[PDB]
Amino acid sequence: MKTEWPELVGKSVEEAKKVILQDKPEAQIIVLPVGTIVTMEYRIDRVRLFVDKLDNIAQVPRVG
Amino acid sequence: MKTEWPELVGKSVEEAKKVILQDKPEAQIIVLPVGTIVTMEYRIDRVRLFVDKLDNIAQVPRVG
Amino acid sequence: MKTEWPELVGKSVEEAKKVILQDKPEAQIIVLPVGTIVTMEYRIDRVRLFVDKLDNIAQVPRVG
Amino acid sequence: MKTEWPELVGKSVEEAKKVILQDKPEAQIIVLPVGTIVTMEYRIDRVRLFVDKLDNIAQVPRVG
Amino acid sequence: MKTEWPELVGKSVEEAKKVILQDKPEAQIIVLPVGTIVTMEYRIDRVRLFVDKLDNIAQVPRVG
Amino acid sequence: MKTEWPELVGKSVEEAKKVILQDKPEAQIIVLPVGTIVTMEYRIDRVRLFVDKLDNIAQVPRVG
Amino acid sequence: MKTEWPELVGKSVEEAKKVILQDKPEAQIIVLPVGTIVTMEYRIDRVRLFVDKLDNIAQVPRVG
Amino acid sequence: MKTEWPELVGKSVEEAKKVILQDKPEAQIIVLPVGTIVTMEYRIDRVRLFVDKLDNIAQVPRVG
Amino acid sequence: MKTEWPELVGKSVEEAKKVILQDKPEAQIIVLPVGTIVTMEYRIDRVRLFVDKLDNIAQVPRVG
Amino acid sequence: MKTEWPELVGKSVEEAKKVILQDKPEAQIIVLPVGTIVTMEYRIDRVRLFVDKLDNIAQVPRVG
Amino acid sequence: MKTEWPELVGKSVEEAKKVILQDKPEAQIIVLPVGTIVTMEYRIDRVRLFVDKLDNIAQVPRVG
Amino acid sequence: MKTEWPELVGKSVEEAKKVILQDKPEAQIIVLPVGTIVTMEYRIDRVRLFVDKLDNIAQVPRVG
């Protein structure tokens, strides 16, 4: 089961959403600034995007 | 008594407000960024929405 | 002496200011985001409003 | 020597600047959000204003 | 292998992106405010830019 | 070697940049909000400006 | 249903546990330092005690 | 698959470890203070215990 | 009504408790480290002591 | 090159040091509480252990 | 009026207290860990010592 | 002028103090936990050691 997208580091949100949804059609894509305090529970259909000032992906997206 | 809305993760605020108010007509819906420091007391009619950069629900809404 | 306004949770700032000033004409109404670090001294004429992303009251206003 | 302005709690920045400069013509008036982390040294000509979301004075201005 | 760009302190993002990509064509350039909490893993193709209020580079860019 | 500019407390960024560059032509001037977490290394050509909500200098600029 | 114990401010943990359990025999009593970051869910049988350096109750215990 | 232990709120670590390991023999039991900043990845064999000053469980243990 | 004890800055807790209770026999004296995050409500019988590493009073005790 | 030790989650520091040094004889093993703010540079011979209250490994050790 | 003691960086608390009290007999000497959040008012008779893990002075003591 | 000691990562404080003082006899050696908030000014004779739970050097000591 695809769980990480190292290939999207540096890409836009638009491009990240497109690639994740090809790979994971049920994905719930959440867009947060880098450094956001996240204590959440594990959601296997959620993919968090941690984004820089220009809304580019700053770290490896992972399911959860 | 309905207390959680896992079905609204990834949805907009507009859609979350609509579904919560169908389920809970007295709901006081509060919209906060993910990571917000919340020490509050329990309010049985309040539903907090924790939202990402695009105002989509990032976690499971719960009464309180 | 009126000290709390549980009835304003979920309401706008405009409506909160209107109701507080009917109840407390000397009120100094201060509008802060939820989660704001507040070490202040007690001011009996001040009412702090802790507001969400849409400027609705997220918690019970109290004098102080 | 005037050191505190409790009378400006709830007032605007414009009004606070006007009153402080009548009382203290050399004042260097600095406008910060409530909750700002301040480790500074003491400056006898500086007056910090701690302001809420609407740029009203949320606490008692003091020299320093 | 080029790993630091002390020459870009004080320069714009545009100029930093241009110089880094001449030196490192595979660079994934990420733009963050100074003071951002970064616990990340090491990515040898990523260059983080820590920027001030005017989007000028405030510290030495480094690979990672 | 000029290292501090107490005379710029309360002044604008424009005026601070002008005075610092007269005094220190190589200066790399960085503009940050008051309260910004700064763990940096010492750069003898850098001058950080810590600015309030109105982009006035809130503390004594120093080299580093 | 008893929900707050203002009478225990300043008292020890031992005394607080004794009084709470007389009033609320099912109580799960949790002892935390003042200032502890608490995002928890509401537990109607739990009573949190926020304690100072000497393990005296520093604020009003409340159910939750 | 057992995922939460609401029955251990208020109990000791010793008792929590005993009950969790009966229910989940592969459990890796980790003991942290309440309020600990946790950005971790999901580990299906790990159970975190969030403990108060007296090493009693302050919140519902959950797998992850 | 006595509300501040500037005379106890630098003194021990023992001495502070003794002087406060002479001045304010109903006082509930709470001992916290400097820098403790305090969002509390106003309690007119409580006196908080903010103490350094050696349990000496580091700031002016005040009622609240 | 071995870079992660998922097998040490839940184990002691003693056991973690032993296994890491078998796998990586040059390892510089650093022992930190979970939640420690780490902005460091990448050191290929360093292995950080993030430990719980009982000095057991709470997360997957990784080189860096 | 003596206001800073750069000569005490690296020295013990005992030695710092001795030198400060020779220079400033009214001094109220307060001993805090480095990194302590200090929003205080200016006290001209107080000297704060910011100390490392071994109770040595880590920064220049200053009046205030 | 020697400014960094990468060779002391993983070593004890005792050993770090010994090596630094051979290299830099005027050194003022300060011992802080990793993650300590440091806004200080530059002191060319000071060497800060950032130490883990076992008082081993966790990062590269540098002058400042």
Author numbering:
A (entry chain A), B (entry chain A), C (entry chain A), D (entry chain A), E (entry chain A), F (entry chain A), ...: 1 to 64
Paper text:
CI2 is a small single domain protein of 64 residues, which has been extensively used as a model to understand key concepts of protein folding and stability. L49 and I57 are both part of the folding nucleus in CI2 and very important for the stability of the folded state of CI232. Here, we have applied an efficient in-cell assay in E. coli to select variants of the barley chymotrypsin inhibitor 2 with increased stability. We, therefore, determined the crystal structures of all four CI2 variants in the wild-type to L49I/I57V double mutant cycle.
